[PDB]
Structures are given as C-alpha cells and as structure tokens.
Design a protein around this ligand. Structure first.
Ligand code: RM4
Ligand code: RM4
Lengths: 135, 126
C-alpha cells in the first residue's frame, strides 16, 4: 501497495572477478556461519539485501547481517545489532566495481582468503578480489 | 514490504516530528503515509523498523514508553505478532509478552500496557 518507501527490494549477488559469489556456508541460518566464495546456483543463501541508507548487507535466506568478527579478519553472518562491524561504505568505481569498506576502519575492506575460499577483511591494496561487482 | 500499523479509527503509529533521533516518541497520527509512518516488519527476527529513521520500535526500560532507537537485538525491540483470523494482530513485547502495543488515548501516544483485548490493542498491519 500500500505504500511508497525509499528502500531497495532487489536481491543482490556480490560477485568476484571470476564470476563466483559470496555464499553463506551450508546455507546456514545460524549466527557465526562463514561467508565463503561459491559458484552461483540460484539459492537464497547467495542473495543479499543492501541498504545504502545505513550500510547493511543482509542475507535473504537467514535475515542475518554480513559481519566482521571482533578479530577484524573473519567474515560471518550474525544478527544485526547496529555495529560498526556490520556497516559498510560502498565506494563505487567508474568501471562498475565497488570497494566494500568496513565503517569501523575503512582502510580494511571485503576481500578473500583465496579465489574460491573464504571472505575476509584485509587492508585495501587494489587486489583484484577487493573490487566487487554488486549484481 | 513497508507497512502502516493502523488503529480501529484508521490512524497510525507515527514517529513524532518525523524525527530521526534515538528516543523519539511513537504517537498516533492521521494517516499520510510519510516515511515516519512506515515500518519494515520482519517475522524471522521480530523487529519493527521505521523506514524514515531506520531505527527500531523500542520499549524503554520503564516497560511503558515506546520510542525509536538503534536496533541492538534487545528483547525490548523484539515483538510477537499474534495474528487473528479477521486480520487484526496483537503486538506483544518479547521481554514481557503480557505487555502489548497499546495507546494512552485514541489520538495520543503509543505505549505498552497489559493485554485486556481493548480495541486499540488489535492492530491492522497494512
Ligand atoms: C549446502 C551447500 O553448502 C555449501 O557450503 C554452500 O553454502 C552452498 O550454497 C549450499 O547449497
Ligand atoms: C512534522 C510532523 O510531525 C508530527 O509530529 C508527525 O510526526 C507527522 O507525521 C510529521 O509530518
């Protein structure tokens, strides 16, 4: 309906340069489940809502937020709690890629531990997997 | 997926002054559909989030006053939606579900009160 509201309804994928996607491991609905890289398969555990009014990234399947652990390296899903470790700056590049920076320390950006391995937070060095495609 | 929370008279929960601040009151107001009258409700989590402010409907520690505040996964920001067959809903505070979204008067403030099946305790989520 019944209303006009300013908020994205689109489910997104977060895509690597090889075409793989951020995926919540095991299609888990639990706190602490790892974010990993996986080939795209249509499943809801690879889809995320992104709200650029506040900067959250929420799993469509679990409704939990992409979160950097307190260690400032590991990326999991966890209940949204308005934490700086759950809020992201989307730096949009002219080529259509995006640097996804941690609000708590924006020098630390969404990265991978390997091409088809885990998602992590790492210092920005313009490494290829720090340049995401939000589809 | 934005909703209004509607009273029997057709008025709605409204964040006072269209405020974006922590602690702003939830009040009853004639329906205009501005974003301070619209709320995201997610029944996987149990939150009620203002579209305009992106802050959660929150019971204060006094267990009576209703405000908005940053969502911090508090039991005082989580809600049970008890759905009746005629399309009304009792919105109960997770921290103490005997206490439910209510009003201090027909077009006055939103509060938490013991459930007595008062007409303003039976919301229509539209
Ligand atoms: C069950 C399977 O688990 C994998 O770890 C990955 O999360 C996949 O997307 C999921 O379908
Ligand atoms: C400015 C005005 O303030 C009122 O208290 C109410 O919140 C209305 O919705 C808003 O439009």
């Amino acid at each position: 309906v019944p209303r006009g509201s300013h908020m994205s309804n689109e489910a997104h994928t977060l895509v690597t340069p090889e075409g793989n996607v951020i995926d919540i491991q095991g299609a888990s609905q639990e706190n602490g489940a790892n974010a990993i890289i996986y080939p795209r398969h249509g499943g809801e555990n690879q889809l995320f809502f992104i709200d650029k009014q506040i900067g959250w990234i929420i799993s469509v399947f679990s409704r939990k937020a992409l979160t950097v652990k307190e260690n400032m390296h590991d990326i999991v899903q966890s209940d949204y709690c308005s934490l700086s470790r759950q809020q992201w700056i989307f730096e949009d590049n002219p080529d259509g890629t995006t640097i996804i920076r941690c609000y708590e320390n924006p020098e630390l950006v969404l990265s991978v531990t390997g091409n088809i391995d885990k998602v992590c937070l790492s210092p920005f060095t313009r490494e290829a997997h720090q340049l995401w495609r939000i589809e």
